[PDB]
Short mmCIF file of C-alpha atoms in Angstrom, two decimals:
data_model
loop_
_atom_site.label_atom_id
_atom_site.label_comp_id
_atom_site.label_asym_id
_atom_site.label_seq_id
_atom_site.Cartn_x
_atom_site.Cartn_y
_atom_site.Cartn_z
CA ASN A 4 0.00 0.00 0.00
CA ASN A 5 -0.03 2.01 -2.22
CA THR A 6 1.60 -1.05 -3.80
CA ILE A 7 0.45 -4.19 -5.57
CA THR A 8 2.84 -6.99 -6.55
CA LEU A 9 2.75 -8.03 -10.22
CA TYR A 10 4.34 -11.15 -11.70
CA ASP A 11 5.79 -9.99 -15.01
CA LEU A 12 6.76 -11.74 -18.23
CA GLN A 13 9.88 -10.01 -19.51
CA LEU A 14 12.41 -10.12 -22.32
CA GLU A 15 16.18 -10.12 -21.65
CA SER A 16 16.00 -6.31 -21.76
CA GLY A 17 13.58 -6.35 -18.83
CA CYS A 18 10.89 -5.34 -21.29
CA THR A 19 7.41 -6.84 -21.00
CA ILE A 20 6.26 -8.96 -23.95
CA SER A 21 3.00 -10.55 -22.78
CA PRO A 22 -0.01 -8.48 -23.85
CA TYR A 23 -1.97 -9.81 -20.86
CA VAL A 24 0.72 -8.46 -18.55
CA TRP A 25 0.81 -5.24 -20.56
CA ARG A 26 -2.88 -4.40 -20.12
CA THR A 27 -2.58 -5.31 -16.43
CA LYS A 28 0.30 -2.86 -15.90
CA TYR A 29 -1.86 -0.17 -17.52
CA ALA A 30 -4.89 -1.18 -15.46
CA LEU A 31 -2.87 -0.93 -12.23
CA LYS A 32 -1.50 2.53 -13.11
CA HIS A 33 -4.98 3.61 -14.27
CA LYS A 34 -6.08 2.89 -10.71
CA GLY A 35 -3.07 4.88 -9.50
CA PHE A 36 -1.24 2.05 -7.72
CA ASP A 37 2.51 1.55 -7.53
CA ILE A 38 3.68 -1.78 -8.95
CA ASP A 39 6.09 -4.18 -7.27
CA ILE A 40 7.41 -5.95 -10.36
CA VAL A 41 8.56 -9.55 -10.08
CA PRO A 42 10.86 -10.17 -13.06
CA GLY A 43 11.05 -13.40 -15.04
CA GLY A 44 10.08 -15.09 -18.28
CA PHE A 45 8.36 -18.06 -19.88
CA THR A 46 10.04 -20.76 -17.79
CA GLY A 47 9.77 -21.29 -14.04
CA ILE A 48 6.47 -19.48 -13.53
CA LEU A 49 5.06 -22.04 -11.09
CA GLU A 50 8.21 -21.82 -8.97
CA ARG A 51 8.36 -18.00 -9.20
CA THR A 52 4.89 -17.83 -7.73
CA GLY A 53 4.16 -19.88 -4.60
CA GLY A 54 2.90 -22.73 -6.76
CA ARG A 55 -0.43 -20.90 -7.12
CA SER A 56 -0.11 -20.22 -10.85
CA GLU A 57 1.36 -21.68 -14.04
CA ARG A 58 0.51 -18.47 -15.92
CA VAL A 59 1.14 -14.74 -15.62
CA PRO A 60 0.05 -12.06 -14.94
CA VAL A 61 -0.60 -12.66 -11.27
CA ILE A 62 -1.05 -9.91 -8.70
CA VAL A 63 -0.89 -9.95 -4.91
CA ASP A 64 -2.86 -7.18 -3.20
CA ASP A 65 -1.72 -7.10 0.41
CA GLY A 66 -1.92 -10.90 0.53
CA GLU A 67 -4.88 -11.54 -1.77
CA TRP A 68 -3.83 -13.48 -4.86
CA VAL A 69 -5.63 -12.76 -8.14
CA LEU A 70 -5.05 -14.77 -11.32
CA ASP A 71 -5.91 -13.98 -14.97
CA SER A 72 -5.57 -10.50 -16.48
CA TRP A 73 -9.29 -10.16 -17.16
CA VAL A 74 -10.21 -11.21 -13.61
CA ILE A 75 -7.58 -8.86 -12.21
CA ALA A 76 -9.20 -5.91 -14.00
CA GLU A 77 -12.64 -6.83 -12.64
CA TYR A 78 -11.15 -7.26 -9.17
CA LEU A 79 -9.64 -3.77 -9.28
CA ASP A 80 -12.96 -2.15 -10.20
CA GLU A 81 -14.75 -4.21 -7.52
CA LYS A 82 -12.37 -3.56 -4.63
CA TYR A 83 -11.44 0.00 -5.62
CA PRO A 84 -14.56 1.76 -6.95
CA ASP A 85 -13.13 5.00 -5.56
CA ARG A 86 -10.26 4.94 -8.09
CA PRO A 87 -10.60 5.49 -11.87
CA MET A 88 -12.94 2.87 -13.35
CA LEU A 89 -11.65 0.37 -15.88
CA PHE A 90 -15.01 -0.84 -17.18
CA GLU A 91 -17.97 1.30 -18.20
CA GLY A 92 -20.37 -1.61 -17.77
CA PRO A 93 -21.30 -5.09 -19.07
CA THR A 94 -21.71 -3.90 -22.65
CA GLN A 95 -18.09 -2.72 -22.78
CA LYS A 96 -16.96 -6.17 -21.67
CA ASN A 97 -18.77 -7.93 -24.51
CA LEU A 98 -17.86 -5.49 -27.28
CA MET A 99 -14.27 -5.29 -25.99
CA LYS A 100 -13.88 -9.02 -26.51
CA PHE A 101 -15.17 -8.70 -30.06
CA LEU A 102 -12.61 -5.97 -30.84
CA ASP A 103 -9.83 -7.84 -29.08
CA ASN A 104 -10.48 -11.11 -30.91
CA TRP A 105 -10.46 -9.19 -34.21
CA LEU A 106 -7.15 -7.47 -33.41
CA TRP A 107 -5.71 -10.86 -32.46
CA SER A 108 -6.75 -12.52 -35.71
CA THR A 109 -5.95 -9.48 -37.90
CA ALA A 110 -2.74 -8.15 -36.32
CA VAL A 111 -1.29 -10.73 -33.91
CA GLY A 112 -1.81 -13.67 -36.26
CA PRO A 113 0.34 -12.29 -39.10
CA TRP A 114 2.81 -10.36 -36.91
CA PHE A 115 3.49 -13.42 -34.72
CA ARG A 116 4.99 -15.19 -37.72
CA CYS A 117 6.86 -12.11 -38.89
CA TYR A 118 8.65 -11.77 -35.55
CA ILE A 119 8.75 -15.31 -34.17
CA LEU A 120 12.56 -15.45 -34.42
CA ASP A 121 13.02 -11.98 -32.91
CA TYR A 122 10.62 -13.14 -30.19
CA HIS A 123 12.99 -16.04 -29.46
CA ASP A 124 16.27 -14.14 -29.79
CA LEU A 125 15.14 -11.29 -27.52
CA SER A 126 14.01 -13.68 -24.77
CA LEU A 127 15.90 -14.41 -21.55
CA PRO A 128 18.78 -16.90 -21.98
CA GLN A 129 17.06 -19.48 -19.75
CA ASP A 130 13.91 -19.25 -21.90
CA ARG A 131 15.34 -19.54 -25.41
CA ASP A 132 15.37 -23.35 -25.58
CA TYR A 133 11.84 -23.74 -24.20
CA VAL A 134 10.55 -21.03 -26.53
CA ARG A 135 12.27 -22.59 -29.55
CA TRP A 136 11.04 -26.18 -29.59
CA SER A 137 7.57 -25.45 -28.21
CA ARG A 138 6.71 -22.48 -30.45
CA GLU A 139 8.06 -24.24 -33.54
CA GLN A 140 5.86 -27.23 -32.64
CA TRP A 141 2.74 -26.22 -30.66
CA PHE A 142 1.23 -23.02 -32.07
CA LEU A 143 2.77 -24.11 -34.46
CA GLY A 144 5.46 -24.81 -37.06
CA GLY A 145 5.38 -27.56 -37.88
CA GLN A 146 9.06 -26.70 -38.41
CA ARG A 147 11.50 -24.01 -37.40
CA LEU A 148 11.56 -20.33 -36.46
CA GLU A 149 14.16 -19.09 -38.94
CA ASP A 150 12.09 -20.57 -41.78
CA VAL A 151 8.79 -19.16 -40.50
CA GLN A 152 10.12 -15.62 -39.99
CA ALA A 153 11.91 -15.61 -43.33
CA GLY A 154 9.84 -13.80 -45.95
CA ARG A 155 8.36 -11.26 -43.53
CA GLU A 156 9.43 -8.43 -45.86
CA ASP A 157 6.73 -9.84 -48.14
CA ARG A 158 4.05 -10.32 -45.45
CA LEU A 159 4.33 -7.09 -43.46
CA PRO A 160 3.06 -4.84 -46.29
CA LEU A 161 -0.18 -6.85 -46.33
CA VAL A 162 -1.24 -6.06 -42.76
CA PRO A 163 -1.65 -2.23 -42.65
CA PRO A 164 -4.61 -2.08 -45.06
CA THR A 165 -6.47 -4.73 -43.04
CA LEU A 166 -6.42 -2.46 -39.97
CA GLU A 167 -8.74 0.13 -41.54
CA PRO A 168 -11.86 -0.91 -39.57
CA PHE A 169 -9.92 -0.01 -36.41
CA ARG A 170 -8.67 3.27 -37.93
CA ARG A 171 -12.29 4.12 -38.70
CA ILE A 172 -13.16 4.16 -34.99
CA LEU A 173 -10.12 6.13 -33.79
CA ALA A 174 -10.76 8.74 -36.48
CA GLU A 175 -13.85 9.85 -34.53
CA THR A 176 -12.69 9.55 -30.91
CA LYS A 177 -9.61 10.42 -28.84
CA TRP A 178 -9.69 7.16 -26.87
CA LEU A 179 -11.92 4.09 -27.07
CA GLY A 180 -13.07 5.19 -23.62
CA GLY A 181 -14.01 8.61 -24.98
CA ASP A 182 -12.24 11.72 -23.72
CA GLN A 183 -10.20 9.56 -21.34
CA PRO A 184 -8.73 6.06 -21.72
CA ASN A 185 -9.95 2.90 -19.97
CA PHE A 186 -9.41 -0.88 -20.14
CA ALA A 187 -10.78 -0.95 -23.70
CA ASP A 188 -7.86 1.23 -24.77
CA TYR A 189 -5.35 -0.70 -22.67
CA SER A 190 -6.49 -4.08 -23.99
CA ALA A 191 -6.31 -2.87 -27.60
CA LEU A 192 -2.95 -1.19 -26.92
CA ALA A 193 -1.53 -4.43 -25.49
CA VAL A 194 -1.57 -5.91 -29.00
CA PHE A 195 0.76 -3.16 -30.20
CA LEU A 196 2.80 -3.11 -26.98
CA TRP A 197 3.61 -6.79 -27.53
CA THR A 198 4.50 -6.07 -31.15
CA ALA A 199 6.90 -3.29 -30.15
CA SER A 200 8.66 -5.61 -27.70
CA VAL A 201 9.65 -8.06 -30.48
CA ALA A 202 9.56 -6.16 -33.80
CA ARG A 203 13.16 -5.65 -34.96
CA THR A 204 11.78 -4.12 -38.15
CA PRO A 205 8.79 -1.72 -38.06
CA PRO A 206 5.33 -3.10 -39.02
CA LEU A 207 3.68 0.29 -39.70
CA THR A 208 4.41 3.28 -41.93
CA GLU A 209 5.64 6.51 -40.34
CA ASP A 210 2.40 8.39 -41.10
CA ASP A 211 -0.16 5.71 -40.19
CA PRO A 212 -3.20 7.48 -38.64
CA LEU A 213 -2.99 4.94 -35.79
CA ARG A 214 0.20 6.66 -34.65
CA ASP A 215 -1.72 9.40 -32.83
CA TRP A 216 -3.51 6.96 -30.50
CA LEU A 217 -0.48 4.65 -30.34
CA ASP A 218 2.08 7.25 -29.26
CA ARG A 219 -0.35 8.77 -26.75
CA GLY A 220 -1.05 5.31 -25.32
CA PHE A 221 2.63 4.37 -25.05
CA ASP A 222 3.28 7.74 -23.36
CA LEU A 223 0.57 7.20 -20.72
CA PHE A 224 1.54 6.94 -17.06
CA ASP A 225 5.02 8.45 -17.39
CA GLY A 226 5.87 6.49 -20.54
CA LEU A 227 4.76 3.03 -19.44
CA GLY A 228 5.30 1.77 -22.98
CA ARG A 229 8.65 3.53 -23.38
CA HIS A 230 10.84 0.88 -21.73
CA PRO A 231 14.47 1.02 -23.05
CA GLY A 232 14.06 -2.37 -24.77
CA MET A 233 11.13 -1.29 -26.93
CA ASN A 234 11.33 -1.16 -30.73
CA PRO A 235 9.84 1.45 -33.08
CA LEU A 236 6.45 0.55 -34.54
CA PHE A 237 6.97 2.99 -37.39
CA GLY A 238 9.25 3.05 -40.44
CA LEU A 239 7.82 0.43 -42.80
CA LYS A 240 9.04 1.21 -46.33
CA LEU A 241 6.73 0.16 -49.16
CA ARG A 242 7.17 -0.72 -52.83
CA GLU A 243 5.39 0.45 -55.97
CA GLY A 244 3.27 -2.72 -56.12
CA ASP A 245 2.39 -2.83 -52.41
CA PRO A 246 -1.17 -2.09 -51.27
CA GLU A 247 -1.88 1.40 -49.94
CA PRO A 248 -1.30 1.05 -46.18
CA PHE A 249 -4.33 3.13 -45.12
CA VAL A 250 -7.20 5.21 -46.46
CA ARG A 251 -6.07 8.75 -47.30
CA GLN A 252 -9.22 10.84 -47.26
CA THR A 253 -10.70 14.14 -46.06
CA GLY A 254 -13.14 14.63 -44.47
CA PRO A 255 -16.72 15.84 -44.11
CA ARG B 3 -48.86 13.37 -25.05
CA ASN B 4 -49.69 10.41 -22.83
CA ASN B 5 -46.79 8.02 -23.43
CA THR B 6 -46.66 8.30 -27.20
CA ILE B 7 -44.04 9.11 -29.83
CA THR B 8 -44.72 9.26 -33.57
CA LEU B 9 -42.54 7.12 -35.82
CA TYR B 10 -42.30 7.37 -39.60
CA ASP B 11 -41.88 3.74 -40.67
CA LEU B 12 -40.43 2.12 -43.78
CA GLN B 13 -42.64 -0.83 -44.65
CA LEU B 14 -42.97 -3.59 -47.22
CA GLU B 15 -46.30 -4.57 -48.79
CA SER B 16 -47.00 -6.82 -45.78
CA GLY B 17 -46.71 -3.86 -43.40
CA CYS B 18 -43.44 -5.32 -42.21
CA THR B 19 -40.53 -2.94 -41.50
CA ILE B 20 -37.56 -3.47 -43.83
CA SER B 21 -35.11 -0.72 -42.84
CA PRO B 22 -32.64 -1.81 -40.12
CA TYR B 23 -32.42 1.85 -39.06
CA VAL B 24 -36.17 1.87 -38.46
CA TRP B 25 -35.96 -1.52 -36.73
CA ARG B 26 -33.45 -0.39 -34.11
CA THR B 27 -35.53 2.75 -33.55
CA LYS B 28 -38.67 0.69 -32.89
CA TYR B 29 -36.73 -1.33 -30.31
CA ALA B 30 -35.18 1.80 -28.80
CA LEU B 31 -38.63 3.33 -28.28
CA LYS B 32 -40.09 0.18 -26.71
CA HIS B 33 -36.95 -0.14 -24.55
CA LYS B 34 -37.80 3.29 -23.16
CA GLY B 35 -41.38 2.14 -22.53
CA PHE B 36 -43.07 4.37 -25.11
CA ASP B 37 -46.16 3.64 -27.16
CA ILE B 38 -45.48 4.11 -30.87
CA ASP B 39 -47.77 6.00 -33.23
CA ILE B 40 -46.69 4.47 -36.54
CA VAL B 41 -46.95 6.45 -39.75
CA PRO B 42 -46.98 3.91 -42.59
CA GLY B 43 -45.34 4.19 -46.00
CA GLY B 44 -42.46 2.83 -48.06
CA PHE B 45 -39.50 4.03 -50.10
CA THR B 46 -41.37 6.55 -52.26
CA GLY B 47 -43.06 9.74 -51.06
CA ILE B 48 -41.03 10.29 -47.88
CA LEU B 49 -40.71 14.04 -48.49
CA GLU B 50 -44.48 14.15 -48.99
CA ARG B 51 -45.23 12.09 -45.87
CA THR B 52 -42.95 14.23 -43.73
CA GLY B 53 -43.39 18.00 -43.66
CA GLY B 54 -40.84 18.31 -46.42
CA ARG B 55 -38.64 17.81 -43.37
CA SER B 56 -36.83 14.62 -44.38
CA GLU B 57 -35.96 12.58 -47.45
CA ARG B 58 -35.09 9.66 -45.14
CA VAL B 59 -36.63 7.61 -42.33
CA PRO B 60 -36.70 6.85 -39.42
CA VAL B 61 -37.98 10.19 -38.22
CA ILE B 62 -39.73 10.63 -34.88
CA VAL B 63 -41.91 13.43 -33.57
CA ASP B 64 -41.89 13.82 -29.80
CA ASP B 65 -44.69 16.25 -29.11
CA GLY B 66 -43.42 19.00 -31.42
CA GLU B 67 -39.77 17.87 -31.65
CA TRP B 68 -38.73 16.28 -34.96
CA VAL B 69 -35.71 13.95 -34.64
CA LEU B 70 -33.79 12.58 -37.63
CA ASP B 71 -31.35 9.64 -37.95
CA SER B 72 -31.64 6.46 -35.88
CA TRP B 73 -28.35 6.99 -34.03
CA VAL B 74 -29.32 10.55 -33.11
CA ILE B 75 -32.78 9.43 -32.01
CA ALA B 76 -31.26 6.90 -29.61
CA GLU B 77 -29.01 9.61 -28.14
CA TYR B 78 -31.96 12.02 -27.96
CA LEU B 79 -34.03 9.48 -26.00
CA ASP B 80 -31.22 8.94 -23.48
CA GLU B 81 -30.75 12.70 -23.12
CA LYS B 82 -34.44 13.61 -22.80
CA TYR B 83 -35.48 10.56 -20.76
CA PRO B 84 -32.80 9.66 -18.18
CA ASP B 85 -35.60 8.25 -15.98
CA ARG B 86 -36.38 5.49 -18.49
CA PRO B 87 -34.05 2.53 -19.24
CA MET B 88 -30.75 3.65 -20.81
CA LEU B 89 -29.84 2.79 -24.39
CA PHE B 90 -26.13 3.57 -24.01
CA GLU B 91 -24.05 2.96 -20.89
CA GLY B 92 -21.40 5.43 -22.07
CA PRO B 93 -18.86 6.60 -24.70
CA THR B 94 -17.03 3.27 -24.72
CA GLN B 95 -20.17 1.40 -25.77
CA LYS B 96 -20.71 3.89 -28.59
CA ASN B 97 -17.20 3.43 -29.98
CA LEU B 98 -17.20 -0.37 -29.74
CA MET B 99 -20.71 -0.87 -31.13
CA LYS B 100 -19.73 1.14 -34.20
CA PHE B 101 -16.93 -1.39 -34.65
CA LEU B 102 -19.28 -4.36 -34.28
CA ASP B 103 -21.95 -2.75 -36.47
CA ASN B 104 -19.39 -1.96 -39.19
CA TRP B 105 -18.26 -5.60 -39.11
CA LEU B 106 -21.82 -6.93 -39.30
CA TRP B 107 -22.62 -4.67 -42.26
CA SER B 108 -19.47 -5.80 -44.11
CA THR B 109 -19.84 -9.49 -43.25
CA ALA B 110 -23.60 -10.12 -43.26
CA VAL B 111 -25.53 -7.28 -44.91
CA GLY B 112 -23.27 -6.98 -47.96
CA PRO B 113 -23.48 -10.64 -49.01
CA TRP B 114 -27.13 -11.04 -48.01
CA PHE B 115 -28.06 -7.84 -49.84
CA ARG B 116 -26.90 -9.43 -53.10
CA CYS B 117 -28.68 -12.68 -52.20
CA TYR B 118 -32.09 -11.08 -51.52
CA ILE B 119 -32.24 -7.91 -53.59
CA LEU B 120 -34.85 -9.32 -56.00
CA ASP B 121 -36.94 -10.61 -53.08
CA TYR B 122 -36.48 -7.15 -51.53
CA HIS B 123 -37.91 -5.62 -54.72
CA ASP B 124 -40.77 -8.12 -55.06
CA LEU B 125 -41.89 -7.69 -51.44
CA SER B 126 -41.91 -3.89 -51.46
CA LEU B 127 -45.12 -1.89 -51.86
CA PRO B 128 -46.45 -1.81 -55.46
CA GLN B 129 -45.83 1.94 -55.75
CA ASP B 130 -42.20 1.44 -54.66
CA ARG B 131 -41.24 -1.43 -56.97
CA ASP B 132 -40.01 0.44 -60.04
CA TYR B 133 -38.21 3.01 -57.86
CA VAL B 134 -36.38 0.34 -55.84
CA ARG B 135 -35.45 -1.34 -59.13
CA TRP B 136 -34.03 1.78 -60.79
CA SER B 137 -32.47 3.05 -57.56
CA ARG B 138 -30.60 -0.14 -56.64
CA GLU B 139 -29.58 -0.99 -60.22
CA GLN B 140 -27.61 2.30 -60.46
CA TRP B 141 -26.30 2.93 -56.93
CA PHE B 142 -25.03 -0.12 -55.10
CA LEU B 143 -23.79 -1.92 -58.18
CA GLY B 144 -24.98 -4.72 -58.50
CA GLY B 145 -24.99 -3.25 -61.02
CA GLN B 146 -26.46 -5.62 -63.56
CA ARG B 147 -30.20 -6.16 -63.08
CA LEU B 148 -31.73 -7.34 -59.79
CA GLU B 149 -32.24 -10.75 -61.39
CA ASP B 150 -28.55 -11.13 -62.24
CA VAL B 151 -27.31 -10.07 -58.81
CA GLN B 152 -29.56 -12.49 -56.92
CA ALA B 153 -28.91 -15.35 -59.36
CA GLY B 154 -26.57 -17.98 -57.92
CA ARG B 155 -27.38 -17.14 -54.30
CA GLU B 156 -27.83 -20.85 -53.60
CA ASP B 157 -24.05 -21.09 -53.97
CA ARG B 158 -23.29 -17.94 -51.93
CA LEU B 159 -25.61 -18.32 -48.92
CA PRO B 160 -23.81 -21.40 -47.56
CA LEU B 161 -20.60 -19.33 -47.53
CA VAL B 162 -21.92 -16.76 -45.01
CA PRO B 163 -22.58 -18.79 -41.83
CA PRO B 164 -18.90 -19.74 -41.28
CA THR B 165 -17.85 -16.07 -41.38
CA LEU B 166 -20.22 -15.18 -38.52
CA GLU B 167 -18.19 -17.20 -36.01
CA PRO B 168 -16.50 -14.18 -34.40
CA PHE B 169 -19.98 -12.92 -33.47
CA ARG B 170 -21.07 -16.37 -32.21
CA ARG B 171 -18.02 -16.43 -29.97
CA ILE B 172 -19.28 -13.40 -28.03
CA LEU B 173 -22.89 -14.56 -27.75
CA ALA B 174 -21.84 -17.99 -26.46
CA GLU B 175 -20.68 -16.28 -23.25
CA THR B 176 -23.42 -13.69 -22.67
CA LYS B 177 -27.21 -13.54 -22.59
CA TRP B 178 -27.22 -10.12 -24.27
CA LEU B 179 -24.56 -7.75 -25.60
CA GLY B 180 -25.96 -5.50 -22.88
CA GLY B 181 -25.35 -8.15 -20.22
CA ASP B 182 -28.29 -9.67 -18.35
CA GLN B 183 -30.56 -7.18 -20.12
CA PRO B 184 -30.55 -5.85 -23.70
CA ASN B 185 -29.78 -2.29 -24.83
CA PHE B 186 -29.02 -0.39 -28.05
CA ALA B 187 -26.00 -2.61 -28.79
CA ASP B 188 -28.36 -5.59 -29.04
CA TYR B 189 -30.99 -3.66 -30.99
CA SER B 190 -28.44 -2.35 -33.51
CA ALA B 191 -27.03 -5.85 -34.05
CA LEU B 192 -30.47 -7.46 -34.19
CA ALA B 193 -31.53 -4.90 -36.81
CA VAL B 194 -29.17 -6.57 -39.30
CA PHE B 195 -31.07 -9.84 -38.90
CA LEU B 196 -34.49 -8.19 -38.69
CA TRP B 197 -33.87 -6.62 -42.11
CA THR B 198 -32.76 -9.99 -43.47
CA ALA B 199 -35.84 -11.76 -42.14
CA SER B 200 -38.06 -9.13 -43.78
CA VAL B 201 -36.75 -9.88 -47.31
CA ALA B 202 -35.33 -13.43 -47.16
CA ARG B 203 -37.63 -15.67 -49.22
CA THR B 204 -35.22 -18.54 -48.61
CA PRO B 205 -33.55 -19.02 -45.19
CA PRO B 206 -29.90 -17.88 -44.71
CA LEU B 207 -29.15 -19.86 -41.51
CA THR B 208 -29.35 -23.54 -40.47
CA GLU B 209 -31.98 -24.67 -37.96
CA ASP B 210 -29.25 -25.46 -35.41
CA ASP B 211 -27.21 -22.22 -35.67
CA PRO B 212 -26.03 -21.23 -32.16
CA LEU B 213 -27.12 -17.66 -33.00
CA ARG B 214 -30.76 -18.76 -32.77
CA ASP B 215 -31.03 -18.34 -28.98
CA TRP B 216 -30.18 -14.63 -29.08
CA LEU B 217 -32.06 -14.07 -32.37
CA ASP B 218 -35.32 -15.66 -31.17
CA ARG B 219 -35.21 -13.92 -27.79
CA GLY B 220 -34.47 -10.69 -29.64
CA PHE B 221 -37.28 -11.10 -32.17
CA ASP B 222 -39.66 -11.96 -29.31
CA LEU B 223 -38.86 -8.81 -27.29
CA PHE B 224 -41.56 -6.23 -26.57
CA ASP B 225 -44.50 -8.48 -27.52
CA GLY B 226 -42.94 -10.03 -30.62
CA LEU B 227 -41.73 -6.80 -32.23
CA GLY B 228 -39.81 -9.00 -34.64
CA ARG B 229 -42.79 -11.32 -35.19
CA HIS B 230 -44.85 -9.14 -37.55
CA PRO B 231 -46.99 -11.38 -39.86
CA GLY B 232 -44.88 -10.70 -42.98
CA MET B 233 -41.54 -11.87 -41.57
CA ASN B 234 -39.69 -14.77 -43.19
CA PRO B 235 -37.82 -17.41 -41.18
CA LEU B 236 -34.06 -16.96 -40.74
CA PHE B 237 -33.68 -20.70 -40.27
CA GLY B 238 -33.92 -23.72 -42.54
CA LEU B 239 -30.85 -23.39 -44.77
CA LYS B 240 -30.29 -26.78 -46.38
CA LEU B 241 -26.61 -27.59 -46.74
CA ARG B 242 -25.35 -29.73 -49.60
CA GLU B 243 -22.45 -32.19 -49.87
CA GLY B 244 -19.85 -29.60 -50.91
CA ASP B 245 -20.86 -26.76 -48.57
CA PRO B 246 -18.67 -25.62 -45.64
CA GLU B 247 -19.53 -26.35 -42.00
CA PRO B 248 -21.67 -23.39 -40.85
CA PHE B 249 -20.31 -23.00 -37.30
CA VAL B 250 -17.90 -24.33 -34.68
CA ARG B 251 -19.45 -27.16 -32.69
CA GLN B 252 -17.00 -27.37 -29.75
#
């Protein structure tokens, strides 16, 4: 007090990679708490916690253990209604999940393959083996990470245009939460926060309209998304035959 | 004014509402507990029917207040009647339902429009038929004639159910988009399927589609608002050997 312990999932740079952990960090700072960060990575999670969890994020509030990023957010609104609210109501929760699933299929799907080797190489030394064989086999390969990531220069141009439905929303609002951000923003942002933690070449063009919301989000809470290990999201260079990355239109 | 608001409808020959914008307005009004004074009429003569006030419907008249556009009407009701059940819970709902609505219009309305545009024409009021024909055959392209656009729908309709899975995924975990009770998010989404049911002379969904629970409860709301005599069934799509599996069965 005013502190809550958080079990992180970090890269070798100390930088968070897990989007679930990312939106939980933002949710905690939204509520105005200080975070006691427990470092670590993909391996040894059960041992790092008291045996209470095989997954992160996990928080400990005084001595109350809360598992699952979604549950954590609901817990914070329930126990601390006096601090800035994360959810507007039940309708937000349902429509959030629809947006989140779409971002995951549209952005995370393709980008995961484009950065799967960077993902591995940027991980903690103890993690790299576990990440290698399991990722190139479970999620899956069926073969190896150098072969899956190869050719990303050809895939990355194809993603920006597909994000237009999301651009369409942010064109007419400052935050998903309106004039101020909430968990809808943080959950959406987590997709791009993960991407920045592993993207050793930028997935978006320098003038993508998303940049306004993205930079503001990453700057929130004293630069929560500006950890020294983070990579630029912007700088994608396109070719004559590439698709236009976004709709260029003004503006009645 | 008792408890009454006037609504300029957009009806087919059966008296059934076709416009999804009008549909979600009917639900919004009933959600607020109002009685609806319906002004009938179809696609033609809207400027005549209104005071020269609108070329489009829905329009409502609340005592002397004329209100245009279904989204604005919903906001107007929440602003003027904060004592009656809320349509929006806040700004976040508004932003995220636009995202869902946009997706539903791209995924469901677009393909089903092409599949039912001739039925749409045939079911409209007699005085609207030629206008709907000429209008649609120049604007939304399709394009050819109504007959050509709708031709081959038996091969296209089986392709739509699989693409609705992202929407199923949400409804499999909640009673309503609004939670334990419906609100404008539900009514806006339902309006897509209400429109479809008004023009679909062959069913677009299988009898066992997991969407049916929400759809039937939705259509049944407010004394069967979605059960007007003219409505066609959404269910009964007959899949053939080659067709894709319509939904995830896990």
